[PDB]
Amino acid sequence: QVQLVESGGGLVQAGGSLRLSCVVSGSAVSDYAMGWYRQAPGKQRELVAAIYNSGRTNYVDSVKGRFTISKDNAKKTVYLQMNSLKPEDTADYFCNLLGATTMSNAVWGQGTQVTVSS
């Protein structure tokens, strides 16, 4: 069984910042591209940022210049620095192998909660 353990959420005012982290067992982080996803209540999970083994990063338009994804292969950890937080960023955040949303039966962690207040 794969364990995905997410941390770093919080309640912040608009404009604040958080750093998420996800530790994943097995070889996913060290060997494959990883994504950070978010799910607002009653909505489906959506990819927000991706980190490839090359070091390339890709961000959805709404987070470009605010969020930064990275992964430490040795520590099997993926990070998401979240700056300049906006109310639209409120959601539960999850990390996974890139493409996991295409699999009906993908295992997800519990995620970490991010709330951006006024």
Residue numbers in the entry: 2 to 119
Article excerpt on this structure:
Nbs are derived from natural llama heavy-chain antibodies that are devoid of a light chain and in which the heavy-chain variable domain (VHH) exclusively mediates the interaction with the antigen. The VHH domain is structurally similar to the IgG VH domain, with three complementary-determining regions (CDRs) that are responsible for antigen binding. We describe the introduction of cysteine residues at conserved framework serine positions in a Nb specific for human complement component C5 and subsequent site-specific labelling with Hg derivatives and structure determination by SAD and SIRAS. Hg incorporation did not perturb the structure of the Nb or its antigen-binding capacity.
We were able to crystallize both native Nb36 and Nb36 Ser85Cys labelled with PCMB. Since we obtained the crystal structure of both native Nb36 and PCMB-labelled Nb36-C85 we can compare their structures. Although unintentional, it may have given rise to new crystal forms as our crystals of non­derivatized Nb36 exhibit C2 symmetry in contrast to P21 or P212121 symmetry for the PCMB-derivatized Nb, and in both cases there are Hg-bridged Nb dimers.
